[PDB]
Enzyme design. Structure first.
Site, mmCIF file in Angstrom:
data_model
loop_
_atom_site.group_PDB
_atom_site.id
_atom_site.type_symbol
_atom_site.label_atom_id
_atom_site.label_comp_id
_atom_site.label_asym_id
_atom_site.label_seq_id
_atom_site.Cartn_x
_atom_site.Cartn_y
_atom_site.Cartn_z
ATOM 1 N N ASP A 126 0.844 -1.196 0.000
ATOM 2 C CA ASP A 126 0.000 0.000 0.000
ATOM 3 C C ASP A 126 0.896 1.269 0.000
ATOM 4 O OD1 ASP A 126 -2.620 1.157 -0.077
ATOM 5 O OD2 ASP A 126 -2.668 1.443 2.036
ATOM 6 N N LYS A 128 2.189 4.672 -0.962
ATOM 7 C CA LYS A 128 1.429 5.837 -1.495
ATOM 8 C C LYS A 128 1.923 7.018 -0.730
ATOM 9 C CE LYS A 128 -2.684 3.309 -2.249
ATOM 10 N NZ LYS A 128 -4.184 3.121 -2.137
ATOM 11 N N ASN A 131 0.992 7.423 2.927
ATOM 12 C CA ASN A 131 1.653 6.487 3.852
ATOM 13 C C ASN A 131 3.166 6.722 3.938
ATOM 14 O OD1 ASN A 131 -0.567 3.861 2.667
ATOM 15 N ND2 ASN A 131 -0.800 5.398 4.263
ATOM 16 N N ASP A 147 1.758 2.617 7.786
ATOM 17 C CA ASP A 147 0.513 1.977 7.373
ATOM 18 C C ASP A 147 0.693 0.572 6.750
ATOM 19 O OD1 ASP A 147 -2.041 1.284 6.804
ATOM 20 O OD2 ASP A 147 -2.572 3.033 5.632
ATOM 21 N N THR A 166 4.982 -35.808 -7.633
ATOM 22 C CA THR A 166 3.581 -36.297 -7.785
ATOM 23 C C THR A 166 2.834 -35.346 -8.749
ATOM 24 O OG1 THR A 166 1.975 -37.764 -6.576
ATOM 25 C CG2 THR A 166 2.047 -35.357 -5.894
HETATM 26 N N1 LIG Z 1 2.889 8.390 13.355
HETATM 27 C C1 LIG Z 1 2.186 9.415 12.822
HETATM 28 N N2 LIG Z 1 2.482 10.712 13.060
HETATM 29 C C2 LIG Z 1 1.774 11.744 12.553
HETATM 30 N N3 LIG Z 1 0.721 11.553 11.743
HETATM 31 C C3 LIG Z 1 0.321 10.283 11.433
HETATM 32 C C4 LIG Z 1 1.041 9.125 11.962
HETATM 33 N N4 LIG Z 1 0.460 7.997 11.491
HETATM 34 C C5 LIG Z 1 -0.559 8.413 10.736
HETATM 35 N N5 LIG Z 1 -0.637 9.758 10.678
HETATM 36 C C6 LIG Z 1 -1.643 10.537 9.911
HETATM 37 O O1 LIG Z 1 -2.849 9.778 9.888
HETATM 38 C C7 LIG Z 1 -3.130 9.279 8.546
HETATM 39 C C8 LIG Z 1 -3.688 7.857 8.596
HETATM 40 O O2 LIG Z 1 -2.726 6.931 9.146
HETATM 41 P P1 LIG Z 1 -2.604 5.481 8.462
HETATM 42 O O3 LIG Z 1 -1.815 4.593 9.368
HETATM 43 O O4 LIG Z 1 -2.180 5.652 7.016
HETATM 44 O O5 LIG Z 1 -4.186 5.076 8.477
HETATM 45 P P2 LIG Z 1 -5.090 4.268 7.352
HETATM 46 O O6 LIG Z 1 -4.788 2.807 7.627
HETATM 47 O O7 LIG Z 1 -6.493 4.642 7.792
HETATM 48 O O8 LIG Z 1 -4.707 4.875 6.019
HETATM 49 C C9 LIG Z 1 -1.814 9.411 7.788
HETATM 50 O O9 LIG Z 1 -1.932 9.536 6.371
HETATM 51 C C10 LIG Z 1 -1.178 10.621 8.453
HETATM 52 O O10 LIG Z 1 -1.689 11.804 7.862
HETATM 53 MG MG LIG Z 2 -2.761 5.123 5.100
HETATM 54 MG MG LIG Z 3 0.367 1.178 11.218
#
Ligand SMILES: Nc1ncnc2c1ncn2[C@@H]1O[C@H](COP(=O)(O)OP(=O)(O)O)[C@@H](O)[C@H]1O
Ligand SMILES: [Mg+2]
Ligand SMILES: [Mg+2]
Ligand SMILES: Nc1ncnc2c1ncn2[C@@H]1O[C@H](COP(=O)(O)OP(=O)(O)O)[C@@H](O)[C@H]1O
Ligand SMILES: [Cl-]
Ligand SMILES: [Cl-]
Ligand SMILES: [Mg+2]
Ligand SMILES: [Mg+2]
Lengths: 283, 283
Positions: A126, A128, A131, A147, A166
């Site tokens: 995933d 992107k 992420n 993510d 086999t």
């Molecule tokens: N460790 C982090 N620190 C700051 N912002 C975060 C962090 N993790 C996630 N985010 C924010 O939250 C969003 C969603 O997190 P993510 O793990 O990608 O969730 P999902 O599985 O719903 O896509 C990210 O795109 C980012 O903007």
């Molecule tokens: Mg995400």
């Molecule tokens: Mg995670």
């Protein structure tokens, strides 16, 4: 609200503002009471995460997000290091764009993160801009891959077992599949190519705006949307690498190793800036 | 010996002679103390079975082996109904062979067993004469499908989730794979074709004796070994069905439904004999 945070969470953390969200989880700022320092807490509704927590706990790379804690309550709570510069996506929307030097620095880190995953038998699946998180609001910074909700442990042991027959009884399509088995990781290199394309050009390679050829047909033919006017500002080296990652044949597609050896990444200035940022962190 | 049976097993069963073995398990005759009646106990060494036990407990068809009990000790013990006529393999080795009428009766049951699996989302993946057991030493008997060590729960939910993107980032090979996703079960129909070929002719369709063309090359081209002299004794209808099951394209290959509707199986005499055998059992 219609809810409270679980008592075990509240015991250790003071919850604060929303940092972001996606299709899976909402991410909250929090403060860890013991250290008085900032963390991010991802909230995942129960309506697997076991496998995502497991993958995250065993990974140790400066360009991969670290897990700090975990609660299994009415929702799941994943406590993460906080990334104070937000998403890479925020730096490339409005069809806007990064300078080639920072694309390189950010991409180099992405390649290292992904190389490290593939060495450890993990595919992200995933990758992107949403992420890829930045460390600070400063342009030259450390990025982390985040993510891991779609990620898989690499394998083929099922095929390997089938082959210890086999073959008398074995279907032809199982035998055909042996030709490409074990190239799952190549989907990450494709994703990297697309992210690299976007970072360099400000626009997506495959898109429904314009065209008439279906998005699917564009991807399977590998006929990305090339706009000369936009790419004139980008080196030949950068574009050559994009081209090698956006190869439709997953066996001919560049691996993270081949990308790290590409002329574009032989840049001692960029690498020195990366090592500089690493040493700052590690104090 | 170098071992004893676990106390929990011994408590309920008196163990007896070896009935058979394979690459996974050794199968022993036993007597259940409570009923004084015969069972088979499969012994699997620990060096999964959870999933095989789970699949077996939820299946209820007269042409599929039933599980009666289970021990999770230094080895695994799977208690099964006893099949007193042994393997189908024993009836077709020495390049020897069944009369067409009994091939039909046995095959009809196989189709029903497999149809029932596919309806319930299970693929066997190891269908072979050694995994088809006969009820009695009498020629007209009930058969059961056994040995679910390689079987899988049907799915594609991973692909379905991938497709709920966001194809901007999606690799072309994932999109190519959508064309054949959800045809996994077709490997069972191929296996059935091979078993049917063997039962009718006394010899395997793909084999290294003779040829020079590699076994792999024979299977992927679908060029089975046809010996006219051997097939002259077999109806045109039977061979037509073999041909429809041994199709290399898994999307064009006959399903168990299409096979059950084949002219070869429209045989009221055979079906009446099957229902007759069922009612005998069920007393
Ligand atoms: N460790 C982090 N620190 C700051 N912002 C975060 C962090 N993790 C996630 N985010 C924010 O939250 C969003 C969603 O997190 P993510 O793990 O990608 O969730 P999902 O599985 O719903 O896509 C990210 O795109 C980012 O903007
Ligand atoms: Mg995400
Ligand atoms: Mg995670
Ligand atoms: N329920 C049973 N009744 C009688 N014989 C059996 C039974 N189950 C297995 N056998 C004999 O033991 C052999 C091995 O059993 P199977 O479950 O196929 O083991 P493997 O996983 O090792 O192939 C069979 O081919 C058959 O000859
Ligand atoms: Cl490897
Ligand atoms: Cl279906
Ligand atoms: Mg077996
Ligand atoms: Mg079994």
């Amino acid at each position: 609200h219609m809810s409270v945070y679980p008592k075990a969470l509240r015991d250790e953390y003071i919850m604060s503002k929303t940092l972001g969200s996606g299709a899976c989880g909402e991410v909250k700022l929090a403060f860890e009471r013991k250290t008085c320092k900032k963390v991010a807490i991802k909230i995942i509704s129960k309506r697997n995460v076991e496998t995502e927590i497991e993958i995250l706990k065993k990974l140790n790379h400066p360009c991969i997000i670290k897990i700090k804690n975990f609660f299994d309550a009415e929702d799941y709570y994943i406590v993460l290091e906080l990334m104070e510069g937000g998403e890479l996506f925020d730096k490339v929307v409005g069809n806007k764009r990064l300078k080639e030097a920072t694309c390189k620095l950010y991409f180099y880190q992405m390649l290292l993160a992904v190389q490290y995953l593939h060495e450890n038998g993990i595919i992200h699946r995933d990758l992107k801009p949403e992420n890829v998180l930045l460390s600070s609001q400063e342009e030259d910074c450390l990025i982390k891959i985040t993510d891991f909700g779609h990620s898989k442990i690499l394998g083929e042991t099922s095929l390997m077992r089938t082959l210890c027959g086999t073959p008398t009884y074995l279907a032809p399509e199982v035998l055909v599949s042996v030709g490409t088995a074990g190239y799952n990781r190549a989907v990450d290199c494709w994703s990297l190519g697309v992210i690299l394309f976007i970072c360099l050009s400000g626009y997506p390679p495959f898109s429904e705006h314009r065209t008439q050829v279906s998005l699917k047909d564009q991807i399977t033919s590998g006929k990305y949307n090339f706009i000369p006017e936009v790419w004139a500002e980008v080196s030949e080296k950068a574009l050559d690498l994009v081209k090698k990652l956006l190869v439709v044949d997953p066996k001919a597609r560049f691996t993270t190793e081949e990308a790290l050896r590409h002329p574009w990444l032989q840049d001692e200035d960029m690498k020195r800036k990366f090592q500089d940022l690493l040493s700052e962190e590690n104090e």
